[PDB]
Symmetry: D2
Subunit: 432 residues, 4 copies
């Protein structure tokens, strides 16, 4: 059975298309890539299956791949992250998209499965574009017959990369993969500035809480945690950080944040944000220790950061939904407010990162797809990163929109520091 697309409400397409146009202006990276590579159609013959939050921003990525000549199918990598107007606009353009806000797990899995075959004649995918490794897992674990004709994987996020490196270690990585999470222009921008933009946004939409006067706990101080703390502080919340890594903890301290163990920090929290990529950050002992009407949410990729299974089993009978993705539990006479059932809060309760920063991440994606499509045979079944020259190009593409003007090295200056005038400007160990 061939289902051309599945979306919540296709009448939202006009609205979606208007926002896609506005987003295009905020995404000069992607648009510049369309101009540069569009005329040559370098992805003619490519059949790219994407599993990645079906947002307005993602719509621009999809249409960039199509302008480069690709066939494209798509699903979301999270049950609450799809923007239904974005999905509708993509479906109205004739594209095979299977995504809506508020799927269940069976629906989620079905959507990914549909993306593996293209058109009524069922031509299988030959490229994977993934965010979290769920599409990758479906193909490698459940459709291994399809790996022969697939040229490569590109992976968006810290958690999916970790899964790929485990596959590499275990000997089950049977395709080359490009890790674009660790492009400088992704990790140091998307994870950091993106969460800075969208964390507080999502908590405000969900709860309309006053930030000034509140204390918030952010678990983790990697790039997501750094940005999350900055989101909260910029809005006027006082932030306490938790960490396991002494270097990251010392960074937080130097950035002005108190750093304590969660067992202590959680007692003082009006707001709790998990940002670790790890599991069991917030457990039953934490829930029992919390202040009344604490707001608890997660901005790491999966919903195991918060022990929702414990919360639902133990206090599920008291659960009251205020509105979609804002649930209140009565834990022993004090309320706990859970956002998006502990799934990615920025995407679940608002619209995720803004278009401008996603243009950098998605510019990296297109470059990686181009590279594997053209050159997959020169790659081993291992995880790679993009060369610095391409990482620098991505940054360069975003400067003009925001009136950032660079000085140009003279030949003398360039020689003196051991670089060429057009870069790369830093050696490969440079941390920015």
């Amino acid at each position: 059975t061939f289902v051309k697309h599945k979306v919540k409400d296709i009448s939202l397409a006009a609205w979606g298309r208007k926002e896609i146009e506005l987003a295009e202006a905020e995404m000069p990276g992607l648009m510049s890539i369309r101009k540069e590579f569009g005329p040559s159609k370098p992805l003619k013959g490519a059949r790219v299956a994407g599993c990645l939050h079906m947002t307005i921003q993602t719509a621009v990525l999809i249409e960039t791949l199509i302008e480069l000549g690709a066939e494209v199918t798509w699903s979301s990598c999270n049950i609450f992250s799809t923007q239904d107007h974005a999905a509708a606009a993509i479906a109205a353009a004739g594209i095979s998209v299977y995504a809506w806000k508020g799927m269940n797990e069976e629906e989620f899995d079905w959507c990914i499965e549909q993306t593996l075959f293209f058109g009524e004649d069922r031509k299988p995918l030959n490229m994977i574009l993934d965010d979290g490794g769920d599409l990758t897992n479906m193909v490698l674990d459940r459709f291994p017959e399809l790996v022969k004709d697939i040229r490569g994987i590109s992976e968006e996020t810290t958690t999916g990369v970790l899964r790929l490196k485990d596959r590499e270690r275990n000997g089950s990585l049977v395709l080359p993969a490009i890790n674009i999470n660790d492009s400088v222009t992704k990790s140091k921008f998307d994870n950091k500035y993106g969460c800075k933009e969208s964390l507080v946004d999502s908590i405000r939409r969900a709860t309309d809480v006053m930030m000034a006067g509140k204390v918030a706990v952010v678990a983790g101080y990697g790039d997501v945690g750094k940005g999350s703390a900055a989101s909260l502080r910029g809005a006027g919340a006082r932030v306490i950080v938790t960490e396991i890594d002494p270097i990251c903890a010392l960074q937080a301290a130097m950035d002005g944040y108190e750093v304590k163990k969660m067992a202590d920090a959680v007692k003082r929290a009006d707001i709790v944000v998990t940002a670790t990529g790890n599991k069991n950050i917030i457990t039953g002992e934490h829930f029992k220790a919390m202040r009344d009407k604490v707001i608890v949410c997660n901005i790491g990729h999966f919903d195991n950061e918060i022990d929702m299974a414990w919360l639902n089993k133990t206090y599920g009978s008291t659960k009251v939904t205020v509105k979609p993705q804002v649930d209140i539990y009565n834990v022993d006479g004090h309320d706990v407010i859970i956002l998006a059932e502990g799934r990615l809060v920025n995407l679940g309760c608002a619209t995720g990162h803004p278009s401008f920063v996603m243009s950098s991440s998605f510019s990296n994606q297109v470059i990686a797809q181009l590279e594997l499509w053209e050159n997959s045979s020169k790659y081993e079944n291992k995880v790679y990163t993009l060369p610095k020259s391409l990482d620098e190009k991505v940054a360069r593409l975003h400067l003009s929109k925001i009136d950032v003007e660079l000085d140009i090295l003279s030949a003398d200056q360039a020689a003196y520091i051991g670089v060429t005038v057009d870069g790369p400007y830093k050696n490969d160990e440079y941390r920015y």
Copy 2:
């Protein structure tokens, strides 16, 4: 004809009631006032007509007045500020409310008129609680027969106060009025921290624009402008301020902001925010000078800050609505994005100020209503402010929720600085 209430959709009441309960916990001022004054029903016999944004926060004010024994009727003071779930919850409680999001001007005026008479037997109002002076104007200009039995006015905002002071000068102020805008615990908190919380919130909901990398112009650097600049800077925008007052301009400069004339500033703006309480801040010359897809909005009380009449007359034929309260105009080949048709953006495109800060403003309102209801005969037909002891009490009521603990002066310390231990702590000229 007696209409008991008029709201968009009364089935939103359950949702509204849940949020009202959450708001109650964020509003300890109002709740404390309920406990203190509720048992004595000091407003028994009062018939309070309110004209004030019909939000979740306002619902708590309304129900506070009822718990003090008042009859209450209500409308909104802005066509886009009502929260329909709040209005529905109030209507479901049997209260006469006439308010919905997206009224026209005829509807707006009708709603206010209904509030003047209470119940099927049409008992006229005897108290006025106003925000912007539109209810006051309707009674004094169009129902002057009703002034005899009305005991007083309380006024919420800088613009309504200015109208009252003009009436005082002109000799048309025929009731006593308490100006609660200029309670310290209102002006220095609501106008400042409130706009800090809700300005950026509203722009994000409307547009989902990246703030980092953008330049924003804020016109005016009174309390609203101070908070608006802080909202933007905290989110990562670079802010240029405009002013006419050299002191306020020098404040902005000392707070780190470039200060330029609008004619110059507007050319550099990704985002434009009017915060003056004045008219013709953004005119046709400004619109023609703007960058493509500039976002233009107003956070001052009325929609004359931006010359919408000029924009609609001249480029109205190009107008495209993206979604409600986000309109795009093509001004000579470059787009201008207008939020909420130039009306209060925080209330029009998001939910206005959060509950915690509105508890201070509305605590002042209740205190002023109590004071006029009981003691109106001791007042001349002039604008008054509340004594500092009551202003301090309002602040005191909000400290415990956010774990602010005061030291207590010893008798020796109190004598030394010339104050009593329980205050007032500052003389009346103190500016905070």
Copy 3:
């Protein structure tokens, strides 16, 4: 029978050339004062005035002094604090022939003597006829100890929150026997000098004294008036985490809204790497606080007097352990944990660095000159009460500082001005406006 005439007394008059160079640099950072010199200088409106000043003898104050002289005044001067004088500033003023009695590191007897010398001008001892004060100590000396001189004195101008409080007590008690202009409460003073000035100079002074890393530390600021607001901002801007104490629920709620934890001192002090008193009150830090402190806590005061910290208790109880690291940085061993005291608990910004920068002092001192002009010319139209300057002058002061920092104002049309109820050239706010 025969009086001693000392022309000036300064630490080292050979520092004058250095002082003069910095005065010149300061002049460019003080457009308000310089503009006032040009406007009023040619007409010498202070001819015949003999102004005794008691006010921190800094480079900034040198510009004030020479502004008054350019307006035609005779001027004598002392410092209002024992550690606040900048010796090169004092030397430059002395080298210009002016009677200044001030140096860094006076004792109390020396302090009092210096003020006394300022009351009489030249070897022929013409008495003062104007008072320019900062803290009320000159005012107290004249009214309490030289009341014969009050007849010929026309007025007082007062610089600071603490001196104003003293004047209001005199007003209440019935001992204020001269008109006084309170320039502390010019908007362009209190909302700028006290706030942005302390923001600039608090951290500066702690760094010069101790060279401590700010990032990673916790600091307690007692008080959240204008000085406390600026002090907290100084620390936060440098990377310290700040806990505020207060007695005033409104000021406390401000601090909380500005992002600061607010607790009682008994609790706060246990967590403090750095303690700053900013109240204008007494007994903020007592023996119980000292015994509760962390090792090598840095304790200082930025309020006008050294009562905020109980130095008498600290010296009596643990003075035998005192070790001076360098001038104005003393370490006490309080029961096996060290307490570092800056400037013996006196104004830390002036005592351990150079106080507020020239740009903000130009506003405060522009207000001073305006007040001296007003009392000199019009003292008879004033009662023996404390006054403030009209808003039109407060606005003018601000206007004079805009061009240096490229602030440009929009101008209201007549239509706009009518709409908001103001004239085009101001004043733009009513008298109750709090900014």
Copy 4:
């Protein structure tokens, strides 16, 4: 034929007591170094080592020196900058019997002489066998001018971005004839010292030199690497508005995302009240820039060498107008508008104040000691190439600084550790992690 032995050379050895008091205070702010003293001191693992250091002779460096001695090393020392020495620190070190040759305000001949003395230990002239360098000038002297000494030297440790670049050029050219450990690129150095250190000390140094008001000013920072990031943050935290220049599109996009305007110097410099070079490159500020500047602009450099600003051009063209306000604050009249130069364009934080505070230097210097230990014991296992320290040691350094500032870590369970692919005691990040 007969060599002169100078035991030490310092400005004023009577400043030792003051220096010692501040060293003690610094020791408490440097738990990393002190912990390293306790752990390794009893076993004297550096017995027989003769460590020549070339590194700013500050109070912080004194703690490093005495740490190496407590580990059993003989130590000689000079400064790597002519203006960076703190004379009381140098005096304390000399008073302890250590051969130090350093004072504030050397000339170039003096600078070179001081380094030369460090190569031989005691009157009997035992040559150095270890190099501890900051900028590569000691390394250059040994390799270029005393190559006979390379045989017995075991290794080099290098402190700073500029010295590392010199070592990598030697590596490429084939003239690196010793193993080198680059400690600049320990995470706990580059991401802390260069960034948070400059944040602490840039503004400090400008304030001490000029006492300028920061609020209301515009500053240009050239470069947005770690030093530039910290410099911009120093200025913004003090209230200055900062414009950044860059050549690297990624670093430029960072600055823009951090809220800074980013423009070409030709444009930026016209708007600047304050100019700071932070590139490690040459010719950032040239004659065309100087002619375009506002009157009394403050110009300084926080990159390692004085090439960033074209001081040769400024001195040749307008040197006849030069006026020294006080040491390391010089004013030039460039075509009728004044240019204020700090520390003759040399490292401003160290030249006009005291450089980075002790707490952050404890991390950098903990890395130094670890590198010296590693080369002393294990130099034979290294090629003549530049190395960095393993992440496990980089993490250990951080761990040692947590307790002083009350940072407490959560601990992974075995289950959590397995889940994220790490061991419970770390390392917690893979080697490509950028923090």
